[PDB]
RNA sequence: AGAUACCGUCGUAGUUCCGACCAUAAACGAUGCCGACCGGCGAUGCGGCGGCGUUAUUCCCAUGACCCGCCGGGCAGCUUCCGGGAAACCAAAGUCUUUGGGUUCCGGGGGGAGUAUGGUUGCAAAGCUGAAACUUAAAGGAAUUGACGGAAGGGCACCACC
């Protein structure tokens, strides 16, 4: 039985896209197939920003950010709880969760 | 014993103010009282249990066996019904499928093969009906042909007051519910077929909800 | 490509009838399309149609009633003797009381009933009931 | 038995049959 | 629906949609015979005589039921030709 | 059919002829393999001489020993 | 876990709905009302019903409750719902009107009114929400 | 209704539509509602043609006055906006009001206590009141519906093109059609204006009820 | 336990380029191609057409960037009692017992078997073509209910924990 209409990927008029290597494993995943996050992240979380602000040389120093783009295989993504199994009606919602 | 009508239409039927269900079927009125058909065609209505079918749902502990009863009803002169009722015991299933059949009775238009003399004997045109995979085709036949058919639609067409008919089923007819429904869908579509007989532009007679709109206000709440 | 023009036209007015449209545009006008339609008109199945001359193959607008159950083509145009015409009206028409099988004879494009009168068989074009 | 490895075993078996039929030629 | 003698032989003559001219089955429960009240043209009051338009379920679920009644009332002199 | 041409009689016929060999009942009755292989040689009955009496085990669910004869 | 069951609430609603005027806010008086106007076989259930009755009576003092009806229904939804102002919000001196609403009034009989201020049109044709 | 001076659209009725804003339709458009629109504005709003609004109001009024029993014309609104207007329409016309929470199977299930069985539904919004429309499919019930440019005409059998969103425009359309059915019954004369005020039918914000209670003293 | 596995450190053929072979993939949209007809809506890509207004070349022209629509062709999307279908689902998988627009390939219960054998192509690996004897009452498709999970989430208990 055809589960997903798009087939779980995002090529409609190609027939081939290039494989990315999954960041967690090294699995080769079609680019369109891969579950992609763009993690902007402060180099220090919450406990260390308290300390840097006080031990900074500079005057109200804005801290730099660490811009990763994570590519996951479907198996890695579900195991690491990035994506998740949904009900057959709720599968069709392409809205990203708030 | 004494029937008490709850719907608007049932109240008219009981008081002898709509005097034949021909008048109900003219306005496509949903019959939901069982005793409307027991009132009009009451003596010419005969019941044959087509099949008792045990169905089961798998539960924590064993199966929950309920019984599906197909009842074909109809007077051997114009009307057929087909009622399907699933229940825990067999007597409740049969009785419920008799009621659902009565509610569901339709009039069959019946025409002529070639020569148009006497009373009508056959289906007026080739009419297919279906549900599931089962496609049933009913074909007009000459007088005295009988109902050339499988024993299930033969049993409904007898009940429809059709003397003569050629059939031609298709798909999994072994599943009786589909086959009985498909042949009932086929005779349903006789008064839903626009022949040249039915071209004379419609004269809209007054509804029974309009003809007796002043009576219904006082007769009940 | 477009090969049977009569086929395109008959299916077009069939799909328009099924929807419940009051008139339909059938894009290529032949002579055979007009004859078929006139035969359907004379038996009251369609209203007064009209052809639209652009200096090409014309278009026809047909005023549909709700009388036409189905309007079909038979492809290819099989060649029907008077003996065979009963076996075509047995397996291509619903009843023996109504419905017609239009066939091109040497006399002209006409229904099976006029073909029987004139004692002239011909090639089947299609049917309507 | 996976249908791919069935197809691999039938190839090896054929490849041994072509090896044993050749030795009479 | 005469026989050879002339006797009307079928047991009821079914209504037929005023929009599409397609007959309305005994169990087309989405049908609607709508009565439109008439007017004494000098007064603007209900006469007692009324125009009756039937519509089959098929057109009602098709969403064309209002435009059908609009044409039928305009084609009856109820709605202005201007509109 | 799929080719509804007025002059498609050899395409319609030769196609049926070719596809009729995928019918199992036809191929059996229209090759010489099923008949040359048949012990009776395409007869209703046949006489043979009993050489031993055999006890054949019933396939399973129902487990009895069916008294056949090797002929 | 002091949640009232359906037997308590149904009884307590019907007791208010039919005998509203006999009740009050005191528990102990309408305890004895519930004794008279109903045949309750338990003392505990009698108290439960009397208790929820009093709770619903305090709720009715605030405003109307979703699962009960009061005789007029109730001097606000009946009487005050017949509110009429001095002059209607429709009866406006200067009615602002779009140039294209002026056009469809011009293609009506009403091409010239006295009390219609035809406005300047909305420049910068930008009326949608951006995508994503 | 058409080509009659008696039932022609009057001058005061245009000012009641322009103040209410019944001409002022939604941003979006249904293909079934292109025939009840003059033109589109700059700043994506569709202008409803009030002449065609008026003809559909009369045709609806005809449909209601044709129903000889005034009781069995069931008048329905779910949204707060209509709940007052439809309840005052019952007072006037002698109709049956269902203001808020239309219980499914009130036309289809007999054994339900609120089993109504009308001859004609009147509906404030085909979208909000989708469940009455759908049960009108299962019992032969012609349906008048106050429709917007956005509204779908699924199972609505005569559409009155309006603003059915705004507080004033709804109550005014209910007032107009209540006054028209009582005119066409011959209850009220047409020369004089009507005693009942069009402002009566308007739903008010519960802010405005306590604002009037404050401004009454 | 074994671990000619999964894990790890190395690591030849290969992986890269040129010249010749090879001709197969879940080579998939598991959906042949051409043509007509049959709902709606918002997008988007390309080209053209029209239209208030912002903006750059400032010195305006006309071009770009936007905005608002129209048309055609394209990858798609959402919605719908068109209609179809065993159903999942499908604006095509519709216009089908009311069966015929044109045309090519191809299937005929499950195995045996893509096997044997002959032919043919290839350096080879292997490709294309391709049975039968025999064996068997099911194999299978879609969906439903349960049970189960080393899948996700929620709830409860001192016969759980803190």
Residue numbers in the entry:
A (entry chain b): 2 to 99
B (entry chain D): 58 to 278
C (entry chain X): 2 to 130
D (entry chain n): 1 to 25
E (entry chain W): 1 to 83
F (entry chain Y): 2 to 72
G (entry chain S): 2 to 133
H (entry chain B): 2 to 218
What does the paper say about this structure?
Colony collapse disorder (CCD) is a multi‐faceted syndrome decimating bee populations worldwide, and a group of viruses of the widely distributed Dicistroviridae family have been identified as a causing agent of CCD. This family of viruses employs non‐coding RNA sequences, called internal ribosomal entry sites (IRESs), to precisely exploit the host machinery for viral protein production. The IAPV‐IRES found in the intergenic region of the IAPV virus belongs to the well‐characterized type IV family of viral IRESs. IRES sequences from this group dispense with all canonical initiation factors and are able to assemble by themselves an elongation competent ribosome, successfully redirecting the cellular machinery for viral protein production by an RNA‐only mechanism. Using cryo‐EM, we comprehensively characterized how the intergenic IRES of IAPV, a virus of the Dicistrovirideae family and a causing agent of the colony collapse disorder (CCD), binds and manipulates ribosomes to redirect them toward the production of viral proteins.
We identified two classes of particles showing robust density for IAPV‐IRES in the context of a binary interaction with the 40S. The two classes present a conformation of the IAPV‐IRES nearly identical (r.m.s.d. = 1.12 Å between the two IRES conformations) but in displaced position with respect to the 40S body. The different position of the 40S head between both classes is a composition of swiveling and tilt movements (indicated by arrows in orthogonal views). The IAPV‐IRES seems to follow the movement of the 40S head, pivoting around the anchored PKI and SL‐IV which are exceptionally stabilized by ribosomal elements from both head and body, effectively “clamping” the IRES to the 40S subunit. All elements of the IAPV‐IRES included in the produced construct were identified in the maps except SL‐VI, which proved disordered—no density could be assigned to it even in low‐pass filtered maps. The IAPV‐IRES inserts two elements of its structure between the head and the body of the 40S subunit, effectively restricting the dynamics of the 40S head to specific ranges of conformations. In this conformation, the IAPV‐IRES fully blocks all three tRNA binding sites of the 40S subunit, interfering with early steps of canonical initiation (Aylett & Ban, 2017). Overall, the IAPV‐IRES is able to manipulate the 40S subunit in isolation, blocking the functional sites where canonical initiation factors eIF1, eIF1A, and eIF5B bind and, at the same time, steering the intrinsic dynamics of the 40S head toward a configuration reminiscent of an early elongation, pre‐translocated state.
